[PDB]
């Protein structure tokens, strides 16, 4: 009924980001495989300038285990910045493939922002890691590309992007104290606003490191009719 319609949506919704992103990690890891050719800081600027990188992401980098660190577009750091201790850093040089970070705040813009990122090997051997960034809001767009309304959220019920910012990096329980949606549930029921709303969860397949799942809310009437 109004199940296998969200069970359907949930799927599609689901489908497309995981194609949005699959291809966005490709060109970070054919980054970092590049980097790792030549390292040298000369060759790694030249290849994040390109315009496949510079028109996909908010900026493209390499930082290396000394906290050397490049930026295309360039941009002026904050005094005492270290690659290292960024969590793009960390989640990549503690994974054997590529990553996705949660959102946070990025040290370029002061914007919130997800990063793909990927350590560089040469011959098993880290050169680095190599990032992408990604706007918050253009995450917001991509998931809004009716009734209702999607919204991702990690495998430990933390909403990572909702079209209702203030509830981004929220749990399901801190966003709604009431009727808690339940990712281990085929559905749930949830008033919010003064109506009653079905939501569903449906796992992304595909993405490296990460357990996400996009959620479906949608008005309990007006789906319904």
């Given at each position: 009924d109004l199940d296998n319609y969200l069970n359907e949506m949930g799927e599609v919704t689901a489908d497309n980001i995981q194609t949005w992103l699959s291809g966005r990690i490709l060109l970070i890891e054919n980054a970092a495989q590049n980097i790792a050719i030549n390292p040298e800081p000369a060759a790694v600027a030249s290849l994040l300038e390109q315009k496949a990188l510079t028109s996909t992401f908010m900026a493209s980098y390499l930082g290396d285990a000394t906290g050397h660190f490049t930026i295309r577009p360039d941009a002026k750091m904050?005094?005492?910045?270290?690659?290292?201790?960024?969590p793009w850093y960390k989640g990549a040089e503690s994974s054997s493939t590529s990553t996705l970070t949660e959102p946070y705040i990025d040290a370029a813009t002061g914007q919130t922002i997800i990063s793909i990122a990927t350590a560089a090997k040469k011959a098993g051997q880290s050169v680095g890691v190599v990032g992408g960034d990604l706007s918050l809001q253009t995450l917001i767009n991509t998931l809004s590309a009716g009734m209702g309304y999607a919204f991702l959220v990690s495998?430990?019920?933390?909403?990572?992007?909702?079209?209702?910012?203030?509830?981004?990096?929220?749990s399901l329980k801190e966003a709604y104290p009431q009727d808690t949606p339940r990712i281990s549930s085929d559905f749930s029921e949830v008033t919010v606003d003064g109506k009653t709303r079905i939501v569903n969860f449906t796992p992304i397949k595909g993405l490296p490191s990460v357990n996400w799942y996009i959620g479906l809310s949608v008005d309990k009437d007006k789906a319904f009719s």
């Open positions: 904050p005094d005492g910045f270290d690659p290292r201790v960024r495998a430990d019920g933390k909403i990572l992007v909702h079209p209702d910012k203030a509830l981004v990096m929220k």
